[PDB]
Amino acid sequence: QLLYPREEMVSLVRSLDRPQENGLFSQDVLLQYPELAESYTKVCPNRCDLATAADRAAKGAYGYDVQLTTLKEDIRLMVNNCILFNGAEGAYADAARTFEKFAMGKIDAYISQKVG
Ligand SMILES: CCCOc1ccc(CCc2nc3cc(-c4c(C)noc4C)ccc3n2CCN2CCOCC2)cc1
Numbered sequence: 001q002l003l004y005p006r007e008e009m010v011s012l013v014r015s016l017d018r019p020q021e022n023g024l025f026s027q028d029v030l031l032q033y034p035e036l037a038e039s040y041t042k043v044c045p046n047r048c049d050l051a052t053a054a055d056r057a058a059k060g061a062y063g064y065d066v067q068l069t070t071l072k073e074d075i076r077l078m079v080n081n082c083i084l085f086n087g088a089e090g091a092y093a094d095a096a097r098t099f100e101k102f103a104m105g106k107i108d109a110y111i112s113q114k115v116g
Contacts, residue, residue: 002063004114009057012110013071016103017050024095025050025078044081048074068107075103 017026028049029040040047053074056062062071079100086092 002060003066004063004068006058006060006063008110008114009060009062009071010054012107013050013054013057013062015106016053016075016099018102020102021095021099024082024092025099027051029081040085043085046077047081048077050078068111071107072104075100075107079103 082096
């Protein structure tokens, strides 16, 4: 059954792309940095970005999980790749962890709104 309409899901995912992250998760790593084709995919054989997630949202990929698990998995993959590739103690990892707490807050606020 369809729980979350495509147009709400597109709006939710677009809302996660904010200026505070200075484009860190806006787009596919390889599209932006083609020199990383072999280096990135060796460390991160599975990847995602907020433009890809918005495309997935628009195609209804996220509408069928009560807890939006499929979307949350695409956010965790972005965040976990950023931390693994740049190193867990560095500034890119800090930026990832701050992004993740915000993104998860925003996703949970939307689920609350849909029940109330
Ligand atoms: C303060 C700690 C974080 O440091 C930052 C320092 C700089 C930036 C902006 C530049 C920048 N460095 C990026 C790194 C990745 C990347 C890599 C490599 N491995 O994992 C990830 C994730 C992705 C996007 C990035 N972008 C954005 C590029 N858009 C800029 C605007 O026009 C389109 C391209 C962002 C954050």
